[PDB]
Enzyme design. Structure first.
Site, PDB file in Angstrom:
ATOM      1  N   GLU A 162      13.462  56.652  52.609  1.00 40.75           N
ATOM      2  CA  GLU A 162      13.747  56.824  54.030  1.00 40.75           C
ATOM      3  C   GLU A 162      15.137  56.262  54.340  1.00 40.75           C
ATOM      4  O   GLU A 162      15.623  55.360  53.662  1.00 40.75           O
ATOM      5  CB  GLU A 162      12.623  56.131  54.835  1.00 40.75           C
ATOM      6  CG  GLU A 162      12.709  56.221  56.375  1.00 40.75           C
ATOM      7  CD  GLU A 162      12.556  57.650  56.853  1.00 40.75           C
ATOM      8  OE1 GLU A 162      11.407  58.152  57.053  1.00 40.75           O
ATOM      9  OE2 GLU A 162      13.620  58.307  56.998  1.00 40.75           O
ATOM     10  N   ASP A 182       8.527  57.651  51.910  1.00 41.81           N
ATOM     11  CA  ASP A 182       9.371  56.576  52.415  1.00 41.81           C
ATOM     12  C   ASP A 182       9.854  55.627  51.334  1.00 41.81           C
ATOM     13  O   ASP A 182      11.010  55.179  51.387  1.00 41.81           O
ATOM     14  CB  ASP A 182       8.620  55.777  53.488  1.00 41.81           C
ATOM     15  CG  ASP A 182       8.435  56.571  54.767  1.00 41.81           C
ATOM     16  OD1 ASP A 182       9.354  57.341  55.115  1.00 41.81           O
ATOM     17  OD2 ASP A 182       7.359  56.455  55.389  1.00 41.81           O
ATOM     18  N   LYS A 228      -1.774  61.386  59.071  1.00 40.83           N
ATOM     19  CA  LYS A 228      -0.820  61.355  57.967  1.00 40.83           C
ATOM     20  C   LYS A 228      -1.420  61.933  56.689  1.00 40.83           C
ATOM     21  O   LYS A 228      -0.730  62.622  55.926  1.00 40.83           O
ATOM     22  CB  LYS A 228      -0.355  59.918  57.732  1.00 40.83           C
ATOM     23  CG  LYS A 228       0.984  59.817  57.073  1.00 40.83           C
ATOM     24  CD  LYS A 228       2.078  60.271  58.011  1.00 40.83           C
ATOM     25  CE  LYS A 228       2.839  59.109  58.635  1.00 40.83           C
ATOM     26  NZ  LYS A 228       4.197  59.616  59.029  1.00 40.83           N
TER      27      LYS A 228
HETATM   28  O1  LIG Z   1      10.320  60.673  57.251  1.00 40.06           O
HETATM   29  C1  LIG Z   1      10.188  60.992  58.437  1.00 40.06           C
HETATM   30  N1  LIG Z   1      10.843  61.998  59.022  1.00 40.06           N
HETATM   31  C2  LIG Z   1      11.845  62.797  58.323  1.00 40.06           C
HETATM   32  C3  LIG Z   1      11.460  64.257  58.242  1.00 40.06           C
HETATM   33  C4  LIG Z   1      11.019  64.838  59.568  1.00 40.06           C
HETATM   34  C5  LIG Z   1      11.936  65.097  60.576  1.00 40.06           C
HETATM   35  C6  LIG Z   1      11.526  65.635  61.787  1.00 40.06           C
HETATM   36  C7  LIG Z   1      10.199  65.923  62.003  1.00 40.06           C
HETATM   37  C8  LIG Z   1       9.276  65.674  61.013  1.00 40.06           C
HETATM   38  C9  LIG Z   1       9.684  65.134  59.802  1.00 40.06           C
HETATM   39  C10 LIG Z   1       9.183  60.316  59.332  1.00 40.06           C
HETATM   40  N2  LIG Z   1       9.114  60.773  60.599  1.00 40.06           N
HETATM   41  C11 LIG Z   1       8.237  60.230  61.445  1.00 40.06           C
HETATM   42  C12 LIG Z   1       8.179  60.770  62.860  1.00 40.06           C
HETATM   43  C13 LIG Z   1       7.065  61.805  63.080  1.00 40.06           C
HETATM   44  C14 LIG Z   1       7.751  63.095  62.652  1.00 40.06           C
HETATM   45  C15 LIG Z   1       9.088  62.983  63.356  1.00 40.06           C
HETATM   46  N3  LIG Z   1       9.384  61.545  63.247  1.00 40.06           N
HETATM   47  C16 LIG Z   1      10.579  60.971  63.445  1.00 40.06           C
HETATM   48  O2  LIG Z   1      10.738  59.766  63.264  1.00 40.06           O
HETATM   49  C17 LIG Z   1      11.730  61.830  63.888  1.00 40.06           C
HETATM   50  C18 LIG Z   1      12.566  62.461  62.976  1.00 40.06           C
HETATM   51  F1  LIG Z   1      12.326  62.322  61.653  1.00 40.06           F
HETATM   52  C19 LIG Z   1      13.637  63.237  63.356  1.00 40.06           C
HETATM   53  C20 LIG Z   1      13.888  63.388  64.706  1.00 40.06           C
HETATM   54  C21 LIG Z   1      13.093  62.783  65.657  1.00 40.06           C
HETATM   55  C22 LIG Z   1      12.032  62.014  65.230  1.00 40.06           C
HETATM   56  F2  LIG Z   1      11.257  61.423  66.169  1.00 40.06           F
HETATM   57  N4  LIG Z   1       7.392  59.240  61.030  1.00 40.06           N
HETATM   58  C23 LIG Z   1       7.430  58.745  59.743  1.00 40.06           C
HETATM   59  O3  LIG Z   1       6.640  57.838  59.406  1.00 40.06           O
HETATM   60  C24 LIG Z   1       8.370  59.316  58.883  1.00 40.06           C
HETATM   61  O4  LIG Z   1       8.402  58.815  57.637  1.00 40.06           O
HETATM   62 MG   LIG Z   2       9.824  59.129  56.138  1.00 41.39          MG
HETATM   63 MN   LIG Z   3       6.952  57.169  57.381  1.00 39.93          MN
END
Ligand SMILES: O=C(NCCc1ccccc1)c1nc([C@@H]2CCCN2C(=O)c2c(F)cccc2F)[nH]c(=O)c1O
Ligand SMILES: [Mg+2]
Ligand SMILES: [Mn+2]
Length: 178
Positions: free
Chosen positions: A61, A89, A115
């Site tokens: 991450e 992550d 998840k």
């Molecule tokens: O790796 C992750 N996202 C990368 C791929 C990704 C990007 C966008 C959407 C889904 C996946 C990841 N994302 C989340 C949460 C829930 C999903 C979105 N989101 C974000 O934080 C987030 C963000 F990614 C981009 C823009 C705005 C955002 F709010 N929660 C984790 O636990 C975690 O690992």
């Molecule tokens: Mg992530």
């Molecule tokens: Mn995560």
């Protein structure tokens, strides 16, 4: 809340969170609860990677997508573990498994199921934290020792208490969606 975020999180974290939001057309100055949540998850990932022996974890991450997948594919080739469908992550070199970290404003069991349903990797370990001291991990295997996990849980509680003292917590706590 934007002021809270900029003063309570490391500038490297804040910069990564701004970039993540802007890559989806979101403005960190407007969607400030999302801004805070992204920062919090990043800080927990970095804390988690610091919680074991030196070299125990690789952080996935917080990297740009090309570098993140370069790390994942490199590990898969080197250790033989199954390549995940989505970016996790961390990778745990001691247990030889990827880790998906979740931080939730709701309840850990709901978030764990969500998840598990989404990533459906079977081999990826899932570890969930709440802001009120609860955690939930695959097979009740919490990976780190109690002291490291307590330090993460204490940090999240501190964030919650700080938001509350600014009347920010009520809006943040209700901002997570299924
Ligand atoms: O790796 C992750 N996202 C990368 C791929 C990704 C990007 C966008 C959407 C889904 C996946 C990841 N994302 C989340 C949460 C829930 C999903 C979105 N989101 C974000 O934080 C987030 C963000 F990614 C981009 C823009 C705005 C955002 F709010 N929660 C984790 O636990 C975690 O690992
Ligand atoms: Mg992530
Ligand atoms: Mn995560």
């Amino acid at each position: 809340m934007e002021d809270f975020v900029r003063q309570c999180f490391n500038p490297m974290i804040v910069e990564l969170a701004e970039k993540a939001m802007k890559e989806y057309g979101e403005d960190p100055k407007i969607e400030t609860n999302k801004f805070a949540a992204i920062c919090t998850h990043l800080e927990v990932c970095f804390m988690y990677s610091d919680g074991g022996s030196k070299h125990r974890f690789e952080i996935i991450e917080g990297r740009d997508r090309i570098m993140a997948w370069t790390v994942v594919n490199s590990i898969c080739n080197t250790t033989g573990v199954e390549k995940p469908k989505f970016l996790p992550d961390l990778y745990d070199y001691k247990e030889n498994r990827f880790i998906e970290i979740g931080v939730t404003r709701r309840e850990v069991h709901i978030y764990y199921l969500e998840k598990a349903n989404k990533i459906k990797s079977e081999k990826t370990h899932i570890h969930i934290f709440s802001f009120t001291g609860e955690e939930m991990a695959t097979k009740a295997d919490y990976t780190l020792d109690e002291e490291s996990r307590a330090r993460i849980k204490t940090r999240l509680f501190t964030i919650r208490q700080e938001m509350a003292s600014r009347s920010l917590w009520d809006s943040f706590r209700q901002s997570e969606r299924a």
